[PDB]
Symmetry: C5
Subunit: 57 residues, 5 copies
Amino acid sequence: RPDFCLEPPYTGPCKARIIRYFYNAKAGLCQTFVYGGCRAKRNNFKSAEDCMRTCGG
Amino acid sequence: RPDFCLEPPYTGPCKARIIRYFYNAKAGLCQTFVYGGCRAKRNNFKSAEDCMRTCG
Amino acid sequence: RPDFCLEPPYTGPCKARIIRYFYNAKAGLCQTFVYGGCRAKRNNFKSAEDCMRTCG
Amino acid sequence: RPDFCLEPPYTGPCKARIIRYFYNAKAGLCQTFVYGGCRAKRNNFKSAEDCMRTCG
Amino acid sequence: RPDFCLEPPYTGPCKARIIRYFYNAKAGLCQTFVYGGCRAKRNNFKSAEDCMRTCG
């Protein structure tokens, strides 16, 4: 798995409150977090399929 | 059904206001609740279809 | 049309601002209202197709 | 074009913040606006394809 | 690539909190920004496919 997958989730400085997915290396699966709408880091997925596939396994 | 289906819905500490479905085991069916965006428990579904099937 | 279709739309006590459809008997058609995210009443449709077929 | 296509967009009294399309006469095309959730007038579409076909 | 791809994203004056995409020329791809719901400039895409197609 990519090492960005080990990064904690980042809401960012913007004000939206949008559901995104992030991989939790600890839990071993992707989980939800609130994304603010700008400045996403890479452990941030619009689709849970993507997060699982990119970071899971 | 899994045991998690018997647990009351859990909004969590985040501040978004998203509709999710939870299984109401008293009523025998899935209903909506407001989820906050993080730290979901398992009786929480984005799709009512999945809720009814999983906890059905 | 089911009798619940005659009921006025029910936002409910939760805090979300979700758009839903409610059949408006007076008007002869389904219209939008803001739903709270919990404790819906039956004149409450996520899909307007569903609202008209069920209530129209 | 339907005459309602000429009407300015109507946010309405409810307090959701929904993106909708309306047709702009001046501009000659559909643009986005913020719909509040209730009391829509007709120059108001969920679909931009619907807006453009109906009013353009 | 179209000149408008070089313009900075424009939230506009309305009060919605909606995610849209803008081409970031300096960065080489499209990113997200919060769109207020009205008065879009052209470097604003509802679809990221469309953004990278139009502007990449």
